[PDB]
Amino acid sequence: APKAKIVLVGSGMIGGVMATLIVQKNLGDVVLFDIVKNMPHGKALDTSHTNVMAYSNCKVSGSNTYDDLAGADVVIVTAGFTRDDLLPLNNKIMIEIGGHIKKNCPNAFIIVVTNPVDVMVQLLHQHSGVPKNKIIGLGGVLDTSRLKYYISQKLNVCPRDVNAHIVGAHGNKMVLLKRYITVGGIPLQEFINNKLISDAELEAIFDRTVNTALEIVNLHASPYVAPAAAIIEMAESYLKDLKKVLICSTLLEGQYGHSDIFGGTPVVLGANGVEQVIELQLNSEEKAKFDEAIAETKRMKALAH
Amino acid sequence: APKAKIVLVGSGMIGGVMATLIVQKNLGDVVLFDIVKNMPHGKALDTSHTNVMAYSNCKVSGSNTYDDLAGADVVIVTAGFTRDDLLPLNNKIMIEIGGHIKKNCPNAFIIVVTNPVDVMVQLLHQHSGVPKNKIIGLGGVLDTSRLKYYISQKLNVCPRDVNAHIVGAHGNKMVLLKRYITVGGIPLQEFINNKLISDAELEAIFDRTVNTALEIVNLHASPYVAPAAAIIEMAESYLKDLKKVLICSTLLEGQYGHSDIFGGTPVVLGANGVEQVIELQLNSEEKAKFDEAIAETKRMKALAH
Amino acid sequence: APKAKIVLVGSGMIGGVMATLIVQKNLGDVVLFDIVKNMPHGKALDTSHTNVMAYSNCKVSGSNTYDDLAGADVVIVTAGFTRDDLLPLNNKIMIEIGGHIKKNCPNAFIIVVTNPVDVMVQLLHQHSGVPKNKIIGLGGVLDTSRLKYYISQKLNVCPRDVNAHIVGAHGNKMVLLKRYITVGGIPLQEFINNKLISDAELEAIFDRTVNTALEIVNLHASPYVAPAAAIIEMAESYLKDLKKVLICSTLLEGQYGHSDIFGGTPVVLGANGVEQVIELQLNSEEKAKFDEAIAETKRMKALAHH
Amino acid sequence: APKAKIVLVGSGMIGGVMATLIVQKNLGDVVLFDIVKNMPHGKALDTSHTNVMAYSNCKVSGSNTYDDLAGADVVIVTAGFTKAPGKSDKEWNRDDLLPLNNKIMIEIGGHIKKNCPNAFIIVVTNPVDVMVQLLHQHSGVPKNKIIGLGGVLDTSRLKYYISQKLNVCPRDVNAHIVGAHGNKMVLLKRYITVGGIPLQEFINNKLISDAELEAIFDRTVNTALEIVNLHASPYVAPAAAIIEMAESYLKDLKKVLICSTLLEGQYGHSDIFGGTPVVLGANGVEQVIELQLNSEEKAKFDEAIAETKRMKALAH
Ligand SMILES: [Ca+2]
Ligand SMILES: [Ca+2]
Ligand SMILES: [Ca+2]
Ligand SMILES: [Ca+2]
C-alpha cells in the first residue's frame, strides 16, 4: 500500500512551507505544481534533501503540467490571481483545475485556499464534480489559530489549550463566537469573571484577529507560514484518519437555514473526508452575523459567474 | 544545560512504562529506584537500549538508594503498599521519602501517585517541606482520559478533541462535571440535543469511568500504561514549560471554600511548577459533590496520622 | 486510506510495550490477541486511554479469536512456550498460527519473535504459505541495539550514531562483525587506533552483547522493552515505506553459500516487505562463524520438525 | 527551565524556515532579528500562530536591535552580502564580498561579545569557513561555542542522491564531506556507507556504478547552482541542517555532525576553521574527530584549507 500522493497546485510561499512540513511529518510524496517554469523543480530539489534531516522518505518533485494530478490522494489549491474584478478570472482558473481533477483524480480529497475561499471552493466543487464530502476550503483553522494564540498569551497558557470558533466565511465577515471560547475546556467567561482578561482586551483581540492578514501584509507580505500549517493539519487529519474537529468551508445543505452555498463550520475530518458537519446551536445575534457572511459569499459568487 | 534528571521512586509496572516513554520523548536521564534488589537495574538496562530505536540520548539507571535523588529535577512517587489499614503504613513511606527529598532535591518538582493520592500528596508535601507549587498528585489527567476516550468512541471523533473535567478527588468520590464536557470546543450538550449521544449513554460512560481501575483489575491488574502516560504528560508540561491546563491534586487555599487540604482541580503546569490554580465556578449541586470528595480525603488523612 | 491493522499474536509484556508504542506513533489500529480470555482485553482497555495523551486515534482491542487476523496488514508473533524440549511444541503452535494466517491474512507482513527465531520464522513460513518477502524474524535490530548502545556509552556519542552488524542467527551463535562497526559513519578502527576505545574493551562489549538477555534475567528483570521497540522499528519501516536497512532473519537463497534456511542479514524493508536482501561480502573468518550459526539453526529445526 | 532563547541574526528565507522548524519542534523562544524594518515582526507574527497547530509554546518575536542578543542561548548568523550593492551580475565576483562581510562580522561579533559572550554561535554567512573564524576573532567566544554550517548540508545532498539510486531510506546513507563548504568541498568516497555497509560492496554488486557516483559527486558540489538556475534558491535544506545542529546542542544529543570548527593541529593545520566531524552536545563542540585520511583525501583537504586561507587574507 504505497505512500499518499499530495499535489500542491500552486508552489508559492504557502506551497513551499506545505512541502517542508509534509516531509517533516513524512505524510506522503509531494508534487509542487506551478505555471511558473522551472521554479517548482528548484523548490522541490531543495526540499527533497530535508528527508535526510527529518529521517523521512517522501519524494518531492516539481511540475508544470496538470497531468501530474494523476493518482493524487490530496490536492491543495493555492493558485489564483491576487478585488471583485478577479472573481471571474479566478472562476476560469477553477474551471481549468476542476476539469483536470475530474479526469486525473476524481477521488482525491481537495483543499481550496484561493481567495475568497468560500466562493472559490464551491466553484471548484461544481467544475470538478467531486463529492461534497471530499472538498473543503481553508478558513476557521487559520482564523481561530490567531484568536487562540492571542488569548493564550494574555492568559499565559499553552496556545492549543485555548479553543475557539470562527464561522460563516473566511474574510472580513468572519463570525467570532465569544460564547464558544474555552481555556483548557473551561468557558472563557469564567476567566473574565475572575478578572484574568477584560471584555475590552478581548474586543481588541477580536479586532486584531479579523485584521491579521492586513497587519502582516503591511509589515511584510501575505501570511504563509500559518496558512500552510493550518492546511497540513487538515490534510493530516484526513490522511491519518484522526477525525479531528476542525472548522472548514463546506457545503451547507440546510444547516443554519442555508443551502447551495459553502460556509465555515466545524467538521470532522477522517479517512472518509468530511465525516460530519457540525451545526452550532447559535443564538439570534450569532446567527444574524452568520447570515451576513453567507450573503457576502453569495454576492461575490454572483460576480464570479 | 544539562539534561533534566528524573527519578522514579517505585520501579513497578507504572515506573517501567514511564522510563520507556521518557526515552521515547528524550525527556531526561532516568533513575529507576526501588527497594527490591537488582530488578530496577535489569529494567534500566533493557530500557536503555531503546535509545537506539528512539534516536534519543537519555541515561537509564537502576538504584536501591535514595542518594540517587541528588540533583533530581523531577521526582515521581509510585511506591507504597497496595484499604484504610495501609494509610498509616504509607504515611511512614511518605515520611521516609520526604526526608530524603528535603535533603537531596528540595527544589525538585514532585508528582505523587501513591493511593489515595489526595491524602498521600499532602503527607509528602508536609514531610518534604517543598513549596506548594512544586508538588502535585496524579488524578484528573488519568480519570478524564477515560471519560474523554469513551465519549470520543461514541461520537467518532479524535479522543483528544474531547475535553472534560473531573475534580475533587482521585477515587470513588471523583466529581464528573457534565457541564464542562466539550467536543472540539463545542459543549457536549449540543451533541445530546442532536441525539448523537443520549443521557443514558452518558451516565453509563460516567459509571464506567469511575470504575475503570476495577474493570481492568477484574480483567488483568491495576492499570499502568495510561497512568504512566498521564504522569509523563504532566512532567513534560513542567520540563518543557508548555503551560498546559491539566487537572491535578493541588493544595487548596480557599478555592471551593476549602483549605489545608489537597484536591483535584485544573492547574497550569510550566517551568515554575503550578503556575496557576484554576477554580471552576461550580453551581451549588456540583459544589456539594466536591465537598463530599474533600470530606473523604480529610477522613482518610485523619486515619493516616 | 483507513488505518493499518496490526495484530499482536501474543499479548505478554512485549505485546503491551508494542501496543503502547503503536499508539504513541499513531501507527495503526491494534489487536492484542492471546490464548487467555481476560488479560488481552484488560491491557487493550488500559492502552486505549493513551490515545488522549498521545493525540492519536488508534483502536486497541483485545481478542481471543484468530478470526481477528482478517484484514491484518502486520502480524507479530510472540506466542509460544517459554530448552530444546520446547522446539516441537512451539512448531505445533506455528502449525496452528500458520493455518489461520493462510486462511485469514495470506498477504499480511509477518514478524516472528518466538525463540529460537531463525527456526520458528521458517517453520511459520512453511506452515502459512506466505511469500518469502512477507515474513521475517526479529534478531539483528535488537542485538545490534545492545552493541550500538554500549559502544556509544564508551565514546560519549549519540547511540544511534553507532552502526553495527550482527548476522547469522539470533542467539548465542550470533556473529558480531567488528569490521562493520561505524561511529558517525566512521570506521570504529579509527577510534581504536586513536586509543579512544581498546580491543579489550570491545571484546568485553561483544561478550556483554551476546549475554545481555541473561544479564537482565539475572537482575530479576525480563527483557521485553527493547525487543518491543526493535519490532516496532521494523513494522514502521514496512507500514510507512521507509526502506530502512535493518538486520532481520530472512530466507537465504544462496547468500553466504546457504539455502533452504532463514538467517540474519541486512534487508531493506518497505511497502513491498523485504525489498532487498543484502549479502555482506564477508571474509573467510567471518564466513566460518556464519556457518556455525546456520548449523545450529539447522540442528534445532530438525528437533522441531514433526 | 525556562526555554532556550534562539536569536536568528538575519531574518531572510533561511531565517524564516528556521523559525518555522523551531516552533514545530518546540525547541525554544525565537527572535527574528534584521536591519530591515517591519519584516521580522511580520514573519514573527505569522510564525507565532503555528504554536496552535504544532501544540508548542515558543514565543516568536521580531527585532531590529542587538539588545535582543541579551540572554541568547543560540545565535544563528545568516546575515551578510550575497551580491555587491548596486552592481550589475557581470562586474562583481565572490571575492569582492569578502571585505564587506568581514565588516559585518566585526559588527555582529562586537555585539555578541557585549551581549552574549558564551552563547552557542552557528555561522552561515558564506564562505562559511572564513566568516566563522572572523566572527570568532571579533567576538571572543570560546572555540567550543562557535561553529559553521557545511557538512550537514552538503552531505544531505550526497546522502539523498545515493539513496534514490539504491532505493533506501535517505538517512541510512552516511557520508562525509570535509575541508570547506564551497567548491573545494572534499567528498570522501571511501567513507560512504549504506546502512553501515561500505558503499564499495554495492558497487561490487553492480547496484550503482563508479560513473553514476561521479555524476552524483558533481551534482552534490553544484547543487546550490542547480537550484539557482531553476529560478529557485536553496534555503529549506540549509535551514533544516542548521536546526539539526542547534537541536543536538540544545537536547544534548551528542550527534556526530560535520561542521566548520577551529583546527588546532588536526590534519596538520592550525589557526584556521575547516569542516570535520564533531560531537555536538550541551557543552558545545565536545569532541573534534580527526579522520585518518589517505594521501589523495589529505591533498584535497589541504586544497580546501588553502582556499579558505586565501579568502581570509582578502577578507582582512
Ligand atoms: Ca485570507
Ligand atoms: Ca487509582
Ligand atoms: Ca532472544
Ligand atoms: Ca553555500
mmCIF file of C-alpha atoms in Angstrom, chain C residues 37-274:
data_model
loop_
_atom_site.group_PDB
_atom_site.id
_atom_site.type_symbol
_atom_site.label_atom_id
_atom_site.label_comp_id
_atom_site.label_asym_id
_atom_site.label_seq_id
_atom_site.Cartn_x
_atom_site.Cartn_y
_atom_site.Cartn_z
ATOM 1 C CA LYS C 37 -9.626 -14.853 27.984
ATOM 2 C CA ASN C 38 -9.489 -11.661 30.022
ATOM 3 C CA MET C 39 -5.921 -10.328 30.048
ATOM 4 C CA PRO C 40 -5.708 -9.001 26.456
ATOM 5 C CA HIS C 41 -8.953 -7.048 26.942
ATOM 6 C CA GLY C 42 -7.590 -5.578 30.195
ATOM 7 C CA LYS C 43 -4.340 -4.471 28.553
ATOM 8 C CA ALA C 44 -6.236 -3.154 25.497
ATOM 9 C CA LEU C 45 -8.548 -1.015 27.655
ATOM 10 C CA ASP C 46 -5.624 0.437 29.643
ATOM 11 C CA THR C 47 -3.660 1.251 26.462
ATOM 12 C CA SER C 48 -6.668 2.687 24.558
ATOM 13 C CA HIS C 49 -6.883 5.602 27.027
ATOM 14 C CA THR C 50 -3.385 6.740 25.972
ATOM 15 C CA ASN C 51 -4.797 7.977 22.654
ATOM 16 C CA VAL C 52 -5.815 11.084 24.624
ATOM 17 C CA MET C 53 -2.283 11.733 25.946
ATOM 18 C CA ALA C 54 -0.727 10.924 22.552
ATOM 19 C CA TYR C 55 -3.138 12.929 20.335
ATOM 20 C CA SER C 56 -3.606 9.685 18.382
ATOM 21 C CA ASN C 57 -6.606 7.759 17.115
ATOM 22 C CA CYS C 58 -5.727 4.069 17.082
ATOM 23 C CA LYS C 59 -8.262 1.465 18.183
ATOM 24 C CA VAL C 60 -6.860 -1.009 20.699
ATOM 25 C CA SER C 61 -8.894 -4.183 21.188
ATOM 26 C CA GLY C 62 -8.400 -7.486 22.952
ATOM 27 C CA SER C 63 -9.081 -10.708 21.128
ATOM 28 C CA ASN C 64 -9.383 -14.399 21.812
ATOM 29 C CA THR C 65 -10.076 -15.371 18.209
ATOM 30 C CA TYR C 66 -7.871 -15.919 15.156
ATOM 31 C CA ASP C 67 -10.804 -14.564 13.111
ATOM 32 C CA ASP C 68 -9.413 -11.130 14.055
ATOM 33 C CA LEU C 69 -6.488 -11.834 11.689
ATOM 34 C CA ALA C 70 -8.946 -10.956 8.888
ATOM 35 C CA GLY C 71 -7.806 -7.654 7.375
ATOM 36 C CA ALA C 72 -4.431 -7.653 9.186
ATOM 37 C CA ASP C 73 -1.641 -5.690 7.496
ATOM 38 C CA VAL C 74 1.038 -6.692 10.038
ATOM 39 C CA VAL C 75 1.064 -9.772 12.269
ATOM 40 C CA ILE C 76 3.595 -10.003 15.101
ATOM 41 C CA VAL C 77 4.013 -13.479 16.620
ATOM 42 C CA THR C 78 5.344 -13.718 20.188
ATOM 43 C CA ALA C 79 3.110 -16.641 21.250
ATOM 44 C CA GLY C 80 4.665 -19.927 22.354
ATOM 45 C CA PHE C 81 6.205 -21.788 25.272
ATOM 46 C CA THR C 82 8.979 -20.109 27.231
ATOM 47 C CA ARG C 83 15.083 -25.523 26.191
ATOM 48 C CA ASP C 84 15.394 -27.750 23.097
ATOM 49 C CA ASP C 85 12.460 -29.729 24.540
ATOM 50 C CA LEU C 86 10.164 -26.807 23.585
ATOM 51 C CA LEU C 87 11.079 -26.973 19.864
ATOM 52 C CA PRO C 88 8.430 -29.460 18.623
ATOM 53 C CA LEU C 89 5.835 -27.918 20.975
ATOM 54 C CA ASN C 90 6.364 -24.465 19.502
ATOM 55 C CA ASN C 91 6.369 -25.975 15.995
ATOM 56 C CA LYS C 92 2.867 -27.241 16.774
ATOM 57 C CA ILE C 93 1.905 -23.685 17.732
ATOM 58 C CA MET C 94 3.418 -22.417 14.432
ATOM 59 C CA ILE C 95 1.319 -25.001 12.545
ATOM 60 C CA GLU C 96 -1.873 -23.618 14.107
ATOM 61 C CA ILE C 97 -0.938 -19.936 13.699
ATOM 62 C CA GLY C 98 0.271 -20.587 10.134
ATOM 63 C CA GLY C 99 -3.040 -22.227 9.232
ATOM 64 C CA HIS C 100 -5.021 -19.219 10.478
ATOM 65 C CA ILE C 101 -2.694 -16.789 8.672
ATOM 66 C CA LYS C 102 -3.124 -18.800 5.453
ATOM 67 C CA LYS C 103 -6.894 -18.645 5.893
ATOM 68 C CA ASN C 104 -7.406 -15.087 7.152
ATOM 69 C CA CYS C 105 -4.486 -12.896 6.019
ATOM 70 C CA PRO C 106 -2.338 -14.698 3.427
ATOM 71 C CA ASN C 107 -0.598 -11.493 2.271
ATOM 72 C CA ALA C 108 -0.002 -9.799 5.636
ATOM 73 C CA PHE C 109 3.541 -8.875 6.652
ATOM 74 C CA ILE C 110 4.579 -11.361 9.345
ATOM 75 C CA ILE C 111 7.204 -10.673 12.018
ATOM 76 C CA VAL C 112 8.160 -13.713 14.112
ATOM 77 C CA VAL C 113 9.658 -13.283 17.582
ATOM 78 C CA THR C 114 9.152 -16.763 19.105
ATOM 79 C CA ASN C 115 12.582 -18.162 20.060
ATOM 80 C CA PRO C 116 14.724 -19.590 18.520
ATOM 81 C CA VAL C 117 13.606 -17.090 15.915
ATOM 82 C CA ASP C 118 15.555 -18.293 12.850
ATOM 83 C CA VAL C 119 13.970 -21.740 13.261
ATOM 84 C CA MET C 120 10.485 -20.545 14.184
ATOM 85 C CA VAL C 121 10.227 -17.991 11.355
ATOM 86 C CA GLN C 122 10.972 -20.660 8.719
ATOM 87 C CA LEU C 123 8.506 -23.044 10.342
ATOM 88 C CA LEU C 124 5.785 -20.353 10.197
ATOM 89 C CA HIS C 125 6.789 -19.574 6.589
ATOM 90 C CA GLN C 126 6.317 -23.255 5.653
ATOM 91 C CA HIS C 127 3.038 -23.619 7.617
ATOM 92 C CA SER C 128 1.478 -20.313 6.410
ATOM 93 C CA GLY C 129 2.470 -20.299 2.740
ATOM 94 C CA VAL C 130 3.166 -16.527 2.857
ATOM 95 C CA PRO C 131 5.634 -15.238 0.239
ATOM 96 C CA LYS C 132 9.298 -15.031 1.289
ATOM 97 C CA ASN C 133 9.229 -11.205 1.009
ATOM 98 C CA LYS C 134 6.442 -11.004 3.632
ATOM 99 C CA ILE C 135 7.869 -12.940 6.599
ATOM 100 C CA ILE C 136 10.859 -12.027 8.746
ATOM 101 C CA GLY C 137 12.265 -12.762 12.162
ATOM 102 C CA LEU C 138 13.393 -10.392 14.885
ATOM 103 C CA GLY C 139 17.101 -10.560 15.582
ATOM 104 C CA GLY C 140 19.714 -8.103 14.393
ATOM 105 C CA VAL C 141 17.847 -4.888 15.195
ATOM 106 C CA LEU C 142 17.679 -5.994 18.850
ATOM 107 C CA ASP C 143 21.182 -7.498 19.133
ATOM 108 C CA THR C 144 22.854 -4.515 17.437
ATOM 109 C CA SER C 145 20.892 -2.060 19.629
ATOM 110 C CA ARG C 146 22.833 -3.517 22.576
ATOM 111 C CA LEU C 147 26.198 -3.349 20.805
ATOM 112 C CA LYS C 148 25.477 0.155 19.461
ATOM 113 C CA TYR C 149 24.381 1.408 22.880
ATOM 114 C CA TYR C 150 27.400 0.058 24.820
ATOM 115 C CA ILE C 151 29.877 1.461 22.298
ATOM 116 C CA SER C 152 28.071 4.819 22.400
ATOM 117 C CA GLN C 153 28.457 4.930 26.213
ATOM 118 C CA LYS C 154 32.219 4.374 25.983
ATOM 119 C CA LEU C 155 32.714 7.001 23.234
ATOM 120 C CA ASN C 156 30.115 9.513 24.527
ATOM 121 C CA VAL C 157 28.180 9.902 21.274
ATOM 122 C CA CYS C 158 24.519 9.569 20.327
ATOM 123 C CA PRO C 159 23.575 5.868 20.492
ATOM 124 C CA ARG C 160 22.078 5.818 17.009
ATOM 125 C CA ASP C 161 25.261 7.293 15.534
ATOM 126 C CA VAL C 162 26.846 3.917 16.214
ATOM 127 C CA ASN C 163 26.052 1.417 13.469
ATOM 128 C CA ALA C 164 26.922 -2.262 13.664
ATOM 129 C CA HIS C 165 26.137 -5.618 12.089
ATOM 130 C CA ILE C 166 25.311 -8.863 13.849
ATOM 131 C CA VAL C 167 24.340 -11.650 11.439
ATOM 132 C CA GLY C 168 23.752 -15.399 11.051
ATOM 133 C CA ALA C 169 21.352 -16.160 13.900
ATOM 134 C CA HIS C 170 19.621 -14.510 16.854
ATOM 135 C CA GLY C 171 21.027 -16.313 19.884
ATOM 136 C CA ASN C 172 24.353 -17.469 21.321
ATOM 137 C CA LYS C 173 25.856 -18.127 17.861
ATOM 138 C CA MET C 174 25.228 -14.542 16.687
ATOM 139 C CA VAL C 175 28.114 -13.272 14.548
ATOM 140 C CA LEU C 176 29.427 -9.860 15.650
ATOM 141 C CA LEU C 177 31.281 -8.165 12.777
ATOM 142 C CA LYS C 178 33.933 -5.799 14.179
ATOM 143 C CA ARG C 179 34.838 -4.762 10.615
ATOM 144 C CA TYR C 180 31.333 -3.318 10.050
ATOM 145 C CA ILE C 181 31.128 -1.087 13.122
ATOM 146 C CA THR C 182 30.977 2.657 12.443
ATOM 147 C CA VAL C 183 30.661 5.758 14.632
ATOM 148 C CA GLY C 184 29.024 8.688 12.824
ATOM 149 C CA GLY C 185 29.776 6.699 9.657
ATOM 150 C CA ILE C 186 33.493 6.476 10.573
ATOM 151 C CA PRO C 187 35.039 3.006 10.981
ATOM 152 C CA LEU C 188 35.460 2.025 14.644
ATOM 153 C CA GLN C 189 39.117 1.126 13.922
ATOM 154 C CA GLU C 190 39.912 4.860 13.749
ATOM 155 C CA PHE C 191 38.747 5.197 17.375
ATOM 156 C CA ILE C 192 40.776 2.129 18.361
ATOM 157 C CA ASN C 193 43.913 3.482 16.641
ATOM 158 C CA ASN C 194 43.331 6.752 18.492
ATOM 159 C CA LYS C 195 43.118 4.915 21.795
ATOM 160 C CA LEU C 196 39.564 6.114 22.500
ATOM 161 C CA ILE C 197 38.495 2.560 22.947
ATOM 162 C CA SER C 198 40.608 -0.590 23.254
ATOM 163 C CA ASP C 199 40.308 -4.031 21.692
ATOM 164 C CA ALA C 200 39.921 -5.426 25.214
ATOM 165 C CA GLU C 201 37.019 -3.055 25.936
ATOM 166 C CA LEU C 202 35.393 -4.026 22.649
ATOM 167 C CA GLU C 203 35.743 -7.704 23.376
ATOM 168 C CA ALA C 204 34.055 -7.184 26.736
ATOM 169 C CA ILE C 205 31.288 -5.252 24.956
ATOM 170 C CA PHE C 206 30.909 -8.149 22.479
ATOM 171 C CA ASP C 207 30.589 -10.642 25.353
ATOM 172 C CA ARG C 208 28.106 -8.364 27.098
ATOM 173 C CA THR C 209 26.033 -8.070 23.898
ATOM 174 C CA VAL C 210 25.751 -11.857 23.493
ATOM 175 C CA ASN C 211 24.805 -12.298 27.163
ATOM 176 C CA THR C 212 22.500 -9.286 27.587
ATOM 177 C CA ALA C 213 19.246 -11.281 27.923
ATOM 178 C CA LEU C 214 20.914 -13.483 30.560
ATOM 179 C CA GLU C 215 22.269 -10.387 32.380
ATOM 180 C CA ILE C 216 18.781 -8.842 32.540
ATOM 181 C CA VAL C 217 17.251 -12.124 33.756
ATOM 182 C CA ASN C 218 19.993 -12.451 36.429
ATOM 183 C CA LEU C 219 18.942 -8.969 37.609
ATOM 184 C CA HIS C 220 15.428 -10.321 38.303
ATOM 185 C CA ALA C 221 14.036 -8.483 35.292
ATOM 186 C CA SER C 222 12.731 -9.688 31.917
ATOM 187 C CA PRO C 223 13.892 -8.279 28.562
ATOM 188 C CA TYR C 224 10.887 -7.002 26.628
ATOM 189 C CA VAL C 225 11.117 -3.196 26.236
ATOM 190 C CA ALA C 226 13.989 -3.111 23.721
ATOM 191 C CA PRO C 227 12.651 -6.202 21.863
ATOM 192 C CA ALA C 228 9.293 -4.418 21.519
ATOM 193 C CA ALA C 229 10.964 -1.215 20.253
ATOM 194 C CA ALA C 230 13.019 -3.197 17.734
ATOM 195 C CA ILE C 231 9.888 -4.928 16.368
ATOM 196 C CA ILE C 232 8.059 -1.616 16.027
ATOM 197 C CA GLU C 233 11.019 -0.097 14.143
ATOM 198 C CA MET C 234 10.684 -2.975 11.658
ATOM 199 C CA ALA C 235 6.894 -2.739 11.395
ATOM 200 C CA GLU C 236 7.097 1.044 10.937
ATOM 201 C CA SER C 237 9.601 0.792 8.055
ATOM 202 C CA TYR C 238 7.144 -1.550 6.317
ATOM 203 C CA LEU C 239 3.989 0.482 7.059
ATOM 204 C CA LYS C 240 5.456 3.897 6.172
ATOM 205 C CA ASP C 241 7.574 2.617 3.249
ATOM 206 C CA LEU C 242 10.766 3.997 4.817
ATOM 207 C CA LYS C 243 13.101 1.455 3.128
ATOM 208 C CA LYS C 244 15.342 1.306 6.183
ATOM 209 C CA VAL C 245 18.271 -1.102 6.132
ATOM 210 C CA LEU C 246 17.552 -3.364 9.106
ATOM 211 C CA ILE C 247 19.085 -6.728 10.048
ATOM 212 C CA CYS C 248 16.370 -9.390 10.212
ATOM 213 C CA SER C 249 16.056 -13.173 9.821
ATOM 214 C CA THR C 250 15.093 -13.839 6.212
ATOM 215 C CA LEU C 251 15.064 -16.710 3.705
ATOM 216 C CA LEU C 252 18.517 -17.326 2.265
ATOM 217 C CA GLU C 253 18.591 -18.473 -1.367
ATOM 218 C CA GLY C 254 22.347 -18.778 -1.972
ATOM 219 C CA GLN C 255 23.652 -15.829 0.059
ATOM 220 C CA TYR C 256 26.641 -16.787 2.195
ATOM 221 C CA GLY C 257 26.531 -20.196 0.418
ATOM 222 C CA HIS C 258 23.303 -21.207 2.210
ATOM 223 C CA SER C 259 19.776 -22.056 1.102
ATOM 224 C CA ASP C 260 16.503 -23.557 2.452
ATOM 225 C CA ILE C 261 17.144 -21.758 5.756
ATOM 226 C CA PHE C 262 16.490 -18.378 7.443
ATOM 227 C CA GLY C 263 19.362 -16.319 8.798
ATOM 228 C CA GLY C 264 20.170 -12.820 9.992
ATOM 229 C CA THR C 265 21.316 -10.396 7.323
ATOM 230 C CA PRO C 266 20.654 -6.744 6.448
ATOM 231 C CA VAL C 267 17.489 -6.293 4.372
ATOM 232 C CA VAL C 268 15.554 -3.309 3.054
ATOM 233 C CA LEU C 269 12.038 -3.060 4.487
ATOM 234 C CA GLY C 270 9.429 -1.046 2.571
ATOM 235 C CA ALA C 271 5.840 -1.252 1.290
ATOM 236 C CA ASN C 272 6.725 -4.427 -0.647
ATOM 237 C CA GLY C 273 8.093 -6.106 2.506
ATOM 238 C CA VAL C 274 11.636 -7.411 2.062
#
